[PDB]
Amino acid sequence: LEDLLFYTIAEGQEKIPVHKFITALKSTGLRTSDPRLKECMDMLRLTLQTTSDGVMLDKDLFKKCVQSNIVLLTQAFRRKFVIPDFMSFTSHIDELYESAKKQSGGKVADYIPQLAKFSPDLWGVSVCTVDGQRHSTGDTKVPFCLQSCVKPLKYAIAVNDLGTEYVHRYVGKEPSGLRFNKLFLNEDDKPHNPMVNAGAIVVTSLIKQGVNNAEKFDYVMQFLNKMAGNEYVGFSNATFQSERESGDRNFAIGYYLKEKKCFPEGTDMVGILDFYFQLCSIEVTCESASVMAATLANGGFCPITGERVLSPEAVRNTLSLMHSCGMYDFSGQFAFHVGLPAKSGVAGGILLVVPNVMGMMCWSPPLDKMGNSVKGIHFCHDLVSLCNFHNYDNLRHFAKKLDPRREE
Amino acid sequence: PSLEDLLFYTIAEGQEKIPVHKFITALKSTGLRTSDPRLKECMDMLRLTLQVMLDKDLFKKCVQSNIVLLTQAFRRKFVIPDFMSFTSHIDELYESAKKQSGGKVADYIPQLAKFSPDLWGVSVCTVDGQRHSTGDTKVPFCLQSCVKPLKYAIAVNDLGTEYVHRYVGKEPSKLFLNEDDKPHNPMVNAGAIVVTSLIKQGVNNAEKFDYVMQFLNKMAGNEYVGFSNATFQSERESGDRNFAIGYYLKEKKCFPEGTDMVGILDFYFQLCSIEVTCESASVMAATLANGGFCPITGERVLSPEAVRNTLSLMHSCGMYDFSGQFAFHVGLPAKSGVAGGILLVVPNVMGMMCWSPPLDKMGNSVKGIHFCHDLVSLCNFHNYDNLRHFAKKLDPRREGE
Amino acid sequence: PSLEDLLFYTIAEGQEKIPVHKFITALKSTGLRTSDPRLKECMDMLRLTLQTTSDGVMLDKDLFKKCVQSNIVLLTQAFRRKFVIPDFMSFTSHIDELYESAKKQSGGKVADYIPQLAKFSPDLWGVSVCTVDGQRHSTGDTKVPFCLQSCVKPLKYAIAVNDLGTEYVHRYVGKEPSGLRFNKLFLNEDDKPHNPMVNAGAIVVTSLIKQGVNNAEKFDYVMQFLNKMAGNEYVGFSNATFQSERESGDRNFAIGYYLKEKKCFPEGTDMVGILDFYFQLCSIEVTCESASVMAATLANGGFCPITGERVLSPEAVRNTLSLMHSCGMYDFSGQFAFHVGLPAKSGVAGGILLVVPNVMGMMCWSPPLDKMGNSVKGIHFCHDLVSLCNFHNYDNLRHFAKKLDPRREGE
Amino acid sequence: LPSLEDLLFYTIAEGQEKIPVHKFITALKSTGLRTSDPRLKECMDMLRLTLQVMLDKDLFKKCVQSNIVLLTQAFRRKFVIPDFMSFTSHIDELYESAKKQSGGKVADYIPQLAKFSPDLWGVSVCTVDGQRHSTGDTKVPFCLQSCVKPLKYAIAVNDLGTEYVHRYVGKEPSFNKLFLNEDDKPHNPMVNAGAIVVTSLIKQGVNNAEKFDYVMQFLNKMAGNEYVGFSNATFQSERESGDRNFAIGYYLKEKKCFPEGTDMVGILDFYFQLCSIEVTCESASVMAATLANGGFCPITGERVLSPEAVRNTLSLMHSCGMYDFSGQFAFHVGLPAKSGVAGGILLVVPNVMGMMCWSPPLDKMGNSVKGIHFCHDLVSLCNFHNYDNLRHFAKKLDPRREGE
Ligand SMILES: O=C(Cc1ccccc1)Nc1nnc(CCSCCc2nnc(NC(=O)Cc3ccccc3)s2)s1
Numbered sequence A: 001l002e003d004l005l006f007y008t009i010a011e012g013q014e015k016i017p018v019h020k021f022i023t024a025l026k027s028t029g030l031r032t033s034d035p036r037l038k039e040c041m042d043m044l045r046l047t048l049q050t051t052s053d054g055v056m057l058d059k060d061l062f063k064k065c066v067q068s069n070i071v072l073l074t075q076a077f078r079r080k081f082v083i084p085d086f087m088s089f090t091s092h093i094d095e096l097y098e099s100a101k102k103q104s105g106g107k108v109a110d111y112i113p114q115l116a117k118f119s120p121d122l123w124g125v126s127v128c129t130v131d132g133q134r135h136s137t138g139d140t141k142v143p144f145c146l147q148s149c150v151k152p153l154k155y156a157i158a159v160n161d162l163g164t165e166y167v168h169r170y171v172g173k174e175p176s177g178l179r180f181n182k183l184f185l186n187e188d189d190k191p192h193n194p195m196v197n198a199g200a201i202v203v204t205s206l207i208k209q210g211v212n213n214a215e216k217f218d219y220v221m222q223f224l225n226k227m228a229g230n231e232y233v234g235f236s237n238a239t240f241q242s243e244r245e246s247g248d249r250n251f252a253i254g255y256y257l258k259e260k261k262c263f264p265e266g267t268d269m270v271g272i273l274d275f276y277f278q279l280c281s282i283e284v285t286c287e288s289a290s291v292m293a294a295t296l297a298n299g300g301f302c303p304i305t306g307e308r309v310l311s312p313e314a315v316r317n318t319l320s321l322m323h324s325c326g327m328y329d330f331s332g333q334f335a336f337h338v339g340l341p342a343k344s345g346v347a348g349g350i351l352l353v354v355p356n357v358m359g360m361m362c363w364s365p366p367l368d369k370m371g372n373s374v375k376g377i378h379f380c381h382d383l384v385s386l387c388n389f390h391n392y393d394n395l396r397h398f399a400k401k402l403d404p405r406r407e408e
Numbered sequence B: 001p002s003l004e005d006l007l008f009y010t011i012a013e014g015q016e017k018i019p020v021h022k023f024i025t026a027l028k029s030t031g032l033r034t035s036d037p038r039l040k041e042c043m044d045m046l047r048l049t050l051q052v053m054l055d056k057d058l059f060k061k062c063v064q065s066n067i068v069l070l071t072q073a074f075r076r077k078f079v080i081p082d083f084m085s086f087t088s089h090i091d092e093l094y095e096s097a098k099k100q101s102g103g104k105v106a107d108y109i110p111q112l113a114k115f116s117p118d119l120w121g122v123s124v125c126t127v128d129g130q131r132h133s134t135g136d137t138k139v140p141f142c143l144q145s146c147v148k149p150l151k152y153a154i155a156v157n158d159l160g161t162e163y164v165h166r167y168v169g170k171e172p173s174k175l176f177l178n179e180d181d182k183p184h185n186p187m188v189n190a191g192a193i194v195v196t197s198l199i200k201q202g203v204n205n206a207e208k209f210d211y212v213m214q215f216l217n218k219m220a221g222n223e224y225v226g227f228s229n230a231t232f233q234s235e236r237e238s239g240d241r242n243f244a245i246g247y248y249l250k251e252k253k254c255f256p257e258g259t260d261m262v263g264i265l266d267f268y269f270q271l272c273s274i275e276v277t278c279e280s281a282s283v284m285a286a287t288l289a290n291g292g293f294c295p296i297t298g299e300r301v302l303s304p305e306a307v308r309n310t311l312s313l314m315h316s317c318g319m320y321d322f323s324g325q326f327a328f329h330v331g332l333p334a335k336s337g338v339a340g341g342i343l344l345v346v347p348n349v350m351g352m353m354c355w356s357p358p359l360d361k362m363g364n365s366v367k368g369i370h371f372c373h374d375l376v377s378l379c380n381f382h383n384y385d386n387l388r389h390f391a392k393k394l395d396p397r398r399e400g401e
Numbered sequence C: 001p002s003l004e005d006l007l008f009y010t011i012a013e014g015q016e017k018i019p020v021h022k023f024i025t026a027l028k029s030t031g032l033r034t035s036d037p038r039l040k041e042c043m044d045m046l047r048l049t050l051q052t053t054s055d056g057v058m059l060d061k062d063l064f065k066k067c068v069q070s071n072i073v074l075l076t077q078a079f080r081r082k083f084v085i086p087d088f089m090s091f092t093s094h095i096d097e098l099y100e101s102a103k104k105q106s107g108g109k110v111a112d113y114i115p116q117l118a119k120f121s122p123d124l125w126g127v128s129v130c131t132v133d134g135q136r137h138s139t140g141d142t143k144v145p146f147c148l149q150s151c152v153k154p155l156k157y158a159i160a161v162n163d164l165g166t167e168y169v170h171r172y173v174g175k176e177p178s179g180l181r182f183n184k185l186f187l188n189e190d191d192k193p194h195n196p197m198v199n200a201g202a203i204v205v206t207s208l209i210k211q212g213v214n215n216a217e218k219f220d221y222v223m224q225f226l227n228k229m230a231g232n233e234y235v236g237f238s239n240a241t242f243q244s245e246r247e248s249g250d251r252n253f254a255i256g257y258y259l260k261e262k263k264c265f266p267e268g269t270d271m272v273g274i275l276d277f278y279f280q281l282c283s284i285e286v287t288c289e290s291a292s293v294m295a296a297t298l299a300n301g302g303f304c305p306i307t308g309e310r311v312l313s314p315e316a317v318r319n320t321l322s323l324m325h326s327c328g329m330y331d332f333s334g335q336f337a338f339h340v341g342l343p344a345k346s347g348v349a350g351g352i353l354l355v356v357p358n359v360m361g362m363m364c365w366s367p368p369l370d371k372m373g374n375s376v377k378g379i380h381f382c383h384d385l386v387s388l389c390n391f392h393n394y395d396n397l398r399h400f401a402k403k404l405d406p407r408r409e410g411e
Numbered sequence D: 001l002p003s004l005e006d007l008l009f010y011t012i013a014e015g016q017e018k019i020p021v022h023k024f025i026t027a028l029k030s031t032g033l034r035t036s037d038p039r040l041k042e043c044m045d046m047l048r049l050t051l052q053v054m055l056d057k058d059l060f061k062k063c064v065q066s067n068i069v070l071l072t073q074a075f076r077r078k079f080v081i082p083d084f085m086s087f088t089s090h091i092d093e094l095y096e097s098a099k100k101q102s103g104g105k106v107a108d109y110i111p112q113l114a115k116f117s118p119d120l121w122g123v124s125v126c127t128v129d130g131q132r133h134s135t136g137d138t139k140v141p142f143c144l145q146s147c148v149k150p151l152k153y154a155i156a157v158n159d160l161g162t163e164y165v166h167r168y169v170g171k172e173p174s175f176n177k178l179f180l181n182e183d184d185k186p187h188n189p190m191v192n193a194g195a196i197v198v199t200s201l202i203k204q205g206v207n208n209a210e211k212f213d214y215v216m217q218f219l220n221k222m223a224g225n226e227y228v229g230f231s232n233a234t235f236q237s238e239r240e241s242g243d244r245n246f247a248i249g250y251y252l253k254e255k256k257c258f259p260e261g262t263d264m265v266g267i268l269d270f271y272f273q274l275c276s277i278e279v280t281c282e283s284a285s286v287m288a289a290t291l292a293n294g295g296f297c298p299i300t301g302e303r304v305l306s307p308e309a310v311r312n313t314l315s316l317m318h319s320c321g322m323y324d325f326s327g328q329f330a331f332h333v334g335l336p337a338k339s340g341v342a343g344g345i346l347l348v349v350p351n352v353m354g355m356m357c358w359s360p361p362l363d364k365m366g367n368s369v370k371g372i373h374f375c376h377d378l379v380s381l382c383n384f385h386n387y388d389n390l391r392h393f394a395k396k397l398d399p400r401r402e403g404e
């Protein structure tokens, strides 16, 4: 079927110029740097070094180049990806980005100076589909800390390694009342859910028990690396030192969890707090965070490597929790109006999943009074407005809505 | 070339003629029923010609009016292509929940207390109108709280989200009112009472009830919908909590201006006392599953906004204090009622009704709860299951008060 | 040597005979009124002998004897300085100053949820005092009638405990203040109303009184009780207020239906009938003067100080004071208990019924209410009273700083 | 017109020309005063001098002359409880009746509490005139624990004033698990959160050791220099296991509930030290009696606390003294009271007396079972209740009148 692909792209010409193949490939939304295309691109480079002709691939030479990644290339070229007309869709992404750009309100988080420093005018959006198709607009290569955006990810790691039953013996599954917002613990002495601070503190104590903080951290970072397809994941020591210095509320919670015996036997509470502040201080960009979201969108498989990272159980539970508990006190309105699993963070990040379709990261630093990014909230509403993405939006009958699949 | 000739050749199986019984049998195994409103012209034509064996020309005369729907059915286009295998799975889950004898039948009124604990039905209607039933599926029972998503859908269809949500909130919560002096959501009693006062304002109760009943008829594709006066009289008599709620709503000025609150409570009780069966309630669920189109008639009944909102609310607040646990484990919008009904939606796939009177300590039906758990264990149907990658799970969209 | 004789000498001051007006003015300066029911023999005899006298208006030692003998004990306590406040004139002078200072406080808002409340003038302000010995004083608008409203709640609770006992009553109703985080809940965890001083507890207390008879008879029974507490001074009924109250009582109907749902009433209760009776009890009218005597009865352990009659059991009074202490001034109850330290009840007419146990009762009336629903003038007055005099619960009798002590000479 | 000392001598002499020392001493004890009373030191020093046998009008006068006012008060029956002997016999009955109340669990969160015997039971009384009585185990040291809370609040109000103190802490009962009220202030000095903030208030800008010395000296005055001490083993255990109090302290710190320059960790140390202060029933009754007496120590005469401090302290003890039981206790018992996890209840009867009751086993609410039973029995017997009428009471007895 390397043969068939040749005929498709050639346009009845004898030979295909390299740049024409590359251009057609990029228009699918794949990137030439995609890890699943490595053999093909290695072969194009090499044959460019060794070639008799200029840039022209004849049937035989194209076959040489694509054969190892032929299945993925034919999917791309046939239009079998989740969003077949990716170019049209990315143009829509850009307009929504421009519209949200206008929304100038909100306040940058200043409780530590690493958050305070960020310009209010930083605004980026990245997309990664479940087939690995990519796009980005605005400030999508600027590093920033996940903060509470790491909470679903470490809950995923916990459930993956340990199972639903073990995890939920320590942490609940439900949104607390709009009037149990300030309660550390529910009636069973369990924190309400893994997306509040007390719940995430307990989740942090479940991961990789019985090794030191360095190894625990290495384990989580290696896991984050796979979810992001080995795109950027780093660490802000400066952020960490600040979080630790001013984490009075989290120390309060940790002492209370200790008193109510909420930790697994043998836990060093102060050491778990330290780990917690480190996980908060992990750095991403919009582009790498979008792939992490897309992994969640894809049932636990990283769409740009094809690697199994998370179990189906881990992903399902994480999405359910992000649905109901992921946007602080705006979670109910968010679920009603947007209808997508989403997690916000105090850096202005919103990690957004569109199950079966794609993953997003939206970043801008000024926050609204709920602590959610202003541009990001406006973007997510506008995205649902446009597209049939909502949770309960009918796949066959959708009104004036467009359907891109169809054609701390 | 002909569409009808193509279908004739596939059913004939290269033989000279198709007997009528063979066509009917083949049609039934797709899940459609011969009383399907969309197949009426075909079935009328069959009646006429029968007044046993059909040839190309005669089959074509019978099927031509309904040829598109029939071709979808026979070319395995439906949402569940292998429906017989799926109904075999449904039957297994039914038998398993049947053995789950726990729970208590509600007895706050005599009409509820009368029902046997042994009654147990499950009905399915897909978004293509494919139908299955097991157990006690033609036994009328009161909707009770199951009517709450239906009347909220009506209110949002008629008035819009913005107007409705001036009076009632949109999030899961003892208290009658949130911080803003609105009831928390249309799914609780307080929100349902306020929703009831939004519908068809400025006409008497008798006209309001007629309007709602006509709307319900369309939702159920004209299958069974009725009303228990006896339940209504009992509900009114014994509804002290609802009167308490109503007088608090009035005090806090929660109703639209010109509201007679004691009249609204009567209408609310009547709406609670509406009767369905499993079969007809499954069609109303399928209407919700199908974007507001009724899958058996093809009629548009509810706006997309109304259905989306109703599903959102059924998700978070549909099964009393088990709503949180239910969302996490089952992952499907669902409403339960004190008669033991669970009205279950699987968006883009199907509508279900499960009925069994004994309730658990949360108010939800024992067998129905056990059923919905097992359904999701077996099938990829959870909201946050993945369509391309899922566990040991079966995907029936694919060929194997 | 005779009790009547010795009294004669002390008032006489060595003169052979006492002019009547001299006896009267001396009697009044103790703080008693000539209209006092326990003085009735004496005053009837003075009037009679005025008609029959050869020497009118002057009083012979044997004529004084004839006049005073029946009421000699009480008059000797008055004239000896054996009353709870011996220098009553100096005290009333202080009451006057505190009254004037409160008068100048002119913020607040007249209630207006019903037209009967609405219409009252914001500048009405009256204070009356009745000591535990029947000594009386009044300043400002103290003969103007107004509804008790929630000021009737400790009174109706007192009647319930009097007739039925603590044990029976508190099966139906709690003993504790709600808290701000159940400020809006009708029932506690045990499904009881939190205390008799909130509307839901008051409704339930209303259902306990004189069970088995019709509303007219229940009403009459409570009115006679009220008449006794007030020493037969003015106690009336506003039908206009009652009709208004039942018309706009959404809140209380909500509560009544919830109480019915949770089985909070005694077996056989007609809850809509109970609500009618409750609205009637809210609509009872007092003046400052008569309500002060009601508060004085509570100050005096259930005896009415101006008639000497036993009205309430010691248990009933003690319970009522304990509840008034902790739960009597809506959401200001905690702040009031800390700063004033006196059992007190407020009402939406701008009434504050105030007890100083073992000393006096008071009624403070002014209609404008602050945010908590308490009378602005009354609140200002209660704080000022406590600043001046050592009448806070936890003020000390032997040691107290720059406070004065009256007991010493010196809806 | 004969001397005050001569008048007193003839009344004790009962016609006889001379008085035996022992006869004077017996008579004096019968008024409830103790021969060790600090106000009687001069008299007892004089008796010690002359005795190294009968006294006569002159030696007697020489002995009692400088304490004659207090002695005359005692002998003429001018003390707040004139028939003290009869009253102490009622106290003994009440004691014996509560002795039979075997139930309750001794606290065991800390080893030092779990050591105590369930059968220890003492009650001490100190009247506002210094009259004393004790039954049971009343000279055994135990920790104040939360009984300390009204005392250190009293100290803070005395030194700093009502308005300063209550910028930091509220004045009201909450049934709540919340650390702070709607205003971000802890609810009242009587809860842990409030007591930790009141701890921060006292003697600011000196080291912990100096702060503790100051509180100890203040406790000494309150107890009229009777027993006060410190359990270091309780302090160490208290600190090692106080996770809830660290949780509170970190939350008070986030919410900026302390005065600027507070070292929160250091405050918690101080707070644990205050909890670990030891008293006896006897000495604790005196501290209660100071509270009952308006801030004056009844056995010394010293002005310990200001009237504002005492009044505020009593008000708070009334509403929030007895943990969850508070509202119930106020309704039935009607007395300012505090209680502690060691089984202590400090009880005040304003203008009459202070008590301390101690018995280690606790009911479900945290209060001592014998203690609670004794407080109910006192109030049903006598008419100590705060809304009990002084003229009119029905078959109650009025000893004021001669018959963590
Ligand atoms: O947040 C305000 C008022 C405010 C402040 C600022 C602005 C406005 C208003 N006040 C606060 N005070 N402290 C706070 C920290 C969390 S409460 C600390 C202790 C607990 N944490 N989780 C608990 N769970 C249970 O007790 C379980 C349970 C629930 C129900 C039944 C049984 C068992 S208790 S927030």
Ligand SMILES: O=C(Cc1ccccc1)Nc1nnc(CCSCCc2nnc(NC(=O)Cc3ccccc3)s2)s1
Binding pocket: B174, B175, B176, B177, B178, B179, B248, C184, C185, C186, C187, C188, C189, C190, C191, C258
């Ligand atoms: O539910 C138990 C305890 C229990 C019972 C049984 C067993 C255990 C425990 N007791 C109950 N007592 N009464 C009940 C009826 C509903 S409360 C009545 C009036 C209100 N309805 N909604 C309101 N909303 C707000 O006032 C909004 C708001 C919230 C926060 C701030 C401002 C405004 S106030 S339930």
